[PDB]
Amino acid sequence: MFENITAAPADPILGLADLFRADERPGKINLGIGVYKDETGKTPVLTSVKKAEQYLLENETTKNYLGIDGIPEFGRCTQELLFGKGSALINDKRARTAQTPGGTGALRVAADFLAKNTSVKRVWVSNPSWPNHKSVFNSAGLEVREYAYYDAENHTLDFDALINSLNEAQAGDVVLFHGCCHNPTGIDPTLEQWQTLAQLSVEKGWLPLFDFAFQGFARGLEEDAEGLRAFAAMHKELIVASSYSKNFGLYNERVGACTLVAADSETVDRAFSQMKAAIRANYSNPPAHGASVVATILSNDALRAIWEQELTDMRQRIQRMRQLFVNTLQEKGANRDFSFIIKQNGMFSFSGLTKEQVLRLREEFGVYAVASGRVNVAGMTPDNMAPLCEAIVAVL
Amino acid sequence: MFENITAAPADPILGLADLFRADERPGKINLGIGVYKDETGKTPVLTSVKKAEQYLLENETTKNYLGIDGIPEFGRCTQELLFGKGSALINDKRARTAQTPGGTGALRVAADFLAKNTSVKRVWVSNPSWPNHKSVFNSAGLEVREYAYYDAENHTLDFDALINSLNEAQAGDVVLFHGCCHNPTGIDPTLEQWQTLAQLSVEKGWLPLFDFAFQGFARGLEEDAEGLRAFAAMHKELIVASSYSKNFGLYNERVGACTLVAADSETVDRAFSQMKAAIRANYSNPPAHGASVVATILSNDALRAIWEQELTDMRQRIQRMRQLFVNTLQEKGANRDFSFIIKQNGMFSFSGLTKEQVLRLREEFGVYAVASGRVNVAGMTPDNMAPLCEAIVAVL
Ligand SMILES: *Cc1c(COP(=O)(O)O)cnc(C)c1O
Ligand SMILES: *Cc1c(COP(=O)(O)O)cnc(C)c1O
Numbered sequence: 001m002f003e004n005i006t007a008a009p010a011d012p013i014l015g016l017a018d019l020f021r022a023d024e025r026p027g028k029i030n031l032g033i034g035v036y037k038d039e040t041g042k043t044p045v046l047t048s049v050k051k052a053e054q055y056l057l058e059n060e061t062t063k064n065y066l067g068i069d070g071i072p073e074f075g076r077c078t079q080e081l082l083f084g085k086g087s088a089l090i091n092d093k094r095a096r097t098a099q100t101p102g103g104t105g106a107l108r109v110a111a112d113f114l115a116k117n118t119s120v121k122r123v124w125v126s127n128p129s130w131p132n133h134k135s136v137f138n139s140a141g142l143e144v145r146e147y148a149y150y151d152a153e154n155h156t157l158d159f160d161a162l163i164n165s166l167n168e169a170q171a172g173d174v175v176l177f178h179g180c181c182h183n184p185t186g187i188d189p190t191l192e193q194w195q196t197l198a199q200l201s202v203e204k205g206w207l208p209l210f211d212f213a214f215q216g217f218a219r220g221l222e223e224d225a226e227g228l229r230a231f232a233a234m235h236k237e238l239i240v241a242s243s244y245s246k247n248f249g250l251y252n253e254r255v256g257a258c259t260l261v262a263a264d265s266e267t268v269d270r271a272f273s274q275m276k277a278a279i280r281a282n283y284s285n286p287p288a289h290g291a292s293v294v295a296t297i298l299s300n301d302a303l304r305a306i307w308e309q310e311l312t313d314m315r316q317r318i319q320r321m322r323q324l325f326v327n328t329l330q331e332k333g334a335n336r337d338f339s340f341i342i343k344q345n346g347m348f349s350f351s352g353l354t355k356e357q358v359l360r361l362r363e364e365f366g367v368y369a370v371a372s373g374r375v376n377v378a379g380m381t382p383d384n385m386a387p388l389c390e391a392i393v394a395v396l
Numbered sequence: 397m398f399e400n401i402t403a404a405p406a407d408p409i410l411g412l413a414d415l416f417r418a419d420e421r422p423g424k425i426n427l428g429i430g431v432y433k434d435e436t437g438k439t440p441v442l443t444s445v446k447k448a449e450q451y452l453l454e455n456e457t458t459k460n461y462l463g464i465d466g467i468p469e470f471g472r473c474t475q476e477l478l479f480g481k482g483s484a485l486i487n488d489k490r491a492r493t494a495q496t497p498g499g500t501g502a503l504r505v506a507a508d509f510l511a512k513n514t515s516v517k518r519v520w521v522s523n524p525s526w527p528n529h530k531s532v533f534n535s536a537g538l539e540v541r542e543y544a545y546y547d548a549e550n551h552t553l554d555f556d557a558l559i560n561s562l563n564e565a566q567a568g569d570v571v572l573f574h575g576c577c578h579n580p581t582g583i584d585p586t587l588e589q590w591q592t593l594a595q596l597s598v599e600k601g602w603l604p605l606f607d608f609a610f611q612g613f614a615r616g617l618e619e620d621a622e623g624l625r626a627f628a629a630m631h632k633e634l635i636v637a638s639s640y641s642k643n644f645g646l647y648n649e650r651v652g653a654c655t656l657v658a659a660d661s662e663t664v665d666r667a668f669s670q671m672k673a674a675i676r677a678n679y680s681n682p683p684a685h686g687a688s689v690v691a692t693i694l695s696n697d698a699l700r701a702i703w704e705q706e707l708t709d710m711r712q713r714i715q716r717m718r719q720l721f722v723n724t725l726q727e728k729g730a731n732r733d734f735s736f737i738i739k740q741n742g743m744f745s746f747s748g749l750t751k752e753q754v755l756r757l758r759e760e761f762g763v764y765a766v767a768s769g770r771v772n773v774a775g776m777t778p779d780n781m782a783p784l785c786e787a788i789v790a791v792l
Contacts (some may be wrong), residue, residue: 001514001515001516001568001603001633002514002633002658002659002663002664002666002667003659003663005513005514005663005666005667005670006666007666007669007670008669008670008672008673011464011673011676014463014464014676014681017461017463018463033461035460035461042457042458043458043459043460044457044458045456045457045458045459049459050453053453054453057446057449057450057453060441061438061440061441062438062439062440062441063439063441063445063645063646063647063648063649064431064439064647064648065413065429065431065641065647065648066648067410067413067414068407068410100679101497101650101679101682101683102679102680102681104678104679104680105678105679105680108677108678108679112535116535117401118397118398118401119397120397132676132677132680135673135676135677136677136678138677139508139512139674139677139678172397207397237397237398245461249459250459251459251460251461252459252460252461252462252681252683252684253459253683253684253685254497254679254681254682254683262398263398263399267398267399267401268398270398270401270402270403271398271401273403273404274401274403274404276404277404277407277531278535280407280410280528280531281504281528281531281532281534281535282500282501282504282532282535282678283496283497283498283500283501283504283650283679284498284500284501284528285410285498285648285650286497286650287497287648287649287650287683287685287686288648288649289649289683289685289686290683290685
């Protein structure tokens with residue numbers, strides 16, 4: 001059966017984690033997958049999730065299966081976070097959320113759902129976007145089309161072009177948005193652009209699918225939610241695939257959410273019984289540990305307060321590394337002005353490096369970066385700043 | 397978009413857990429989902445997994461993403477368990493295993509894999525089988541066909557009919573087998589039938605897909621693996637979807653395995669790079685907690701010894717409840733001979749009850765059973781035995 005199955009390509013982000021692992025050089029530097037590291041270049045488990053696990057160890061009685069949609073407290077907390085405490089989507093019982101295995105699991109459950117219970121034929125993703133977006137919607141049966149987004153000469157969002165591009169998406173089509181910290185560019189819409197974009201979506205009949213994986217990483221929890229809340233206010237229907245991997249440092253426990261919203265209580269509940277059927281034909285019901293940890297921190301005032309300080313510490317450490325990086329590239333003789341990266345939000349820098357400069361940096365300096373030129377600023381510490389900056393200048 | 401999406405049917409097993417939850421009667425009894433309960437009708441978290449979690453709490457340093465296939469130690473331990481320590485599939489590096497979100501996740505990753513990288517059009521499942529089998533392969537794009545299995549008058553496996561049925565499956569087709577504790581019948585093949593079945597599979601060119609979810613629940617860990625090992629010895633290719641939900645009482649942590657085997661090292665590795673690509677387009681990489689717990693117990697002698705005693709305690713408690721149940725139905729005036737259930741292996745009893753007796757037992761006695769007549773003997777305690785037996789006799 002398996003004789004002429006040919007080898008799949010390496011995953012553009014996960015394939016690097018493998019190559020990095022196999023390298024033997026003592027000074028190599030990672031800069032690839034979006035995982036946060038602290039001042040010491042370690043990825044610690046947050047104190048607040050560690051307190052939550054101790055509690056879960058003392059207080060669990062069973063490992064008996066959760067329902068298809070996960071922990072109720074988990075989806076209620078998620079709706080508060082995404083839409084505001086006492087939102088009208090919450091109060092009119094317009095939103096239903098299933099607990100999924102990460103935000104990727106949320107993107108596929110949504111895909112599956114739409115592919116099997118909707119007229120959708122086409123999802124619209126930005127150019128550039130997360131590499132795996134194309135792969136999840138194509139597995140579902142959906143076609144991926146791209147829209148204009150980034151002006152690379154100017155290092156800005158090209159809103160006119162983004163409008164004109166999207167001008168050929170039909171009514172019935174899904175349009176994917178990043179909630180905040182666009183991946184890979186780091187450039188987000190303004191509030192005024194998000195609302196212009198919200199009102200155009202509705203006069204054209206696009207169903208919005210938000211990928212919200214970095215809430216708390218651009219300006220704050222709530223501030224980062226404004227764009228989505230501006231869409232929630234205009235729209236009868238939305239689906240948001242959200243994650244807790246980064247903002248909770250809970251990467252390998254796989255914890256996210258697919259929250260579905262329709263015009264009313266009856267429609268949302270009927271639409272969700274099909275979403276729960278897609279889940280049951282895939283992994284059946286979700287992993288408890290990580291999601292019980294989120295629910296515990298979010299449920300407890302003391303434990304929530306510790307967590308928000310932790311996430312504030314992470315936004316601030318990335319912001320200092322971002323500034324450090326353009327400062328050191330300048331005084332290391334960078335033969336280009338790199339201060340546009342000061343303006344990007346998130347864990348990353350979309351540096352401008354070509355595929356072959358990126359290739360040469362791993363092959364002879366051992367600094368690993370994604371081939372789109374995307375580098376992880378949260379992977380930068382004061383201790384490896386001068387080494388990677390010296391490497392970059394040597395290839396420019 | 398969502399206006400005319402109609403409601404999905406209730407899941408035949410999970411829908412009952414919901415109905416049970418909503419019932420208000422103080423004496424209701426569950427008997428539906430296959431979850432083990434102890435003498436007190438509780439589903440405890442095993443002492444050995446509780447010791448493993450304490451250790452993981454002391455000793456973890458990060459929640460950083462696992463690779464697409466999970467924990468290496470986890471897949472190596474899984475191969476020992478499934479095929480024998482020092483097996484030639486292990487020694488010739490013929491087997492590769494991905495860590496999945498339960499055995500359902502393993503069944504779908506396999507489905508996805510085959511649907512996208514193989515000529516397979518049709519999976520063959522027994523009649524009766526696990527209700528969700530049909531649902532996972534149909535989501536993948538695969539057709540489900542059924543083969544003959546159980547003689548209901550005689551309460552036996554009808555091997556002639558099972559042979560003749562399967563006589564119209566072509567070369568290239570998948571045939572699903574249950575490793576041990578057939579669900580729902582509890583009737584397994586003999587060693588002699590498993591080997592007859594193994595040698596027929598190979599002269600006909602069926603690819604075997606084993607669902608192995610109850611290892612340790614019929615006779616012992618190793619004894620329960622004989623059938624699969626008899627197939628492993630004849631076959632160049634196999635795929636086994638295995639679970640640790642029941643034998644580790646780790647139901648909601650979602651822990652299982654899809655292990656793939658090809659004719660040699662090169663083919664298996666090339667076939668697995670595509671299997672890892674199907675995973676990445678679905679939930680991306682697996683939940684660590686449950687799988688790190690399995691790997692820890694299986695890696696440690698002290699902790700392994702405690703676990704095997706625990707699983708031995710569970711096989712034995714179900715065997716005493718099985719015997720109790722036919723004894724009490726007889727002295728409660730059962731108007732049928734029920735001692736064929738003494739012979740079935742596993743958590744269940746395929747009782748013979750019709751859909752309307754099963755319906756009437758939940759509607760006026762509140763004992764919940766699956767509508768195929770399947771009742772969970774591991775849900776029976778000495779304290780609810782007489783109540784449910786009295787209920788059953790009243791409906792016969
Ligand atoms: C991280 C991320 C996801 C998925 O998050 P996980 O929780 O790790 O699955 C999806 N899309 C984007 C853009 C992300 O950054
Ligand atoms: C339990 C079971 C599965 C899946 O096991 P999980 O680990 O709970 O996903 C698959 N098939 C059968 C027959 C089972 O009993």
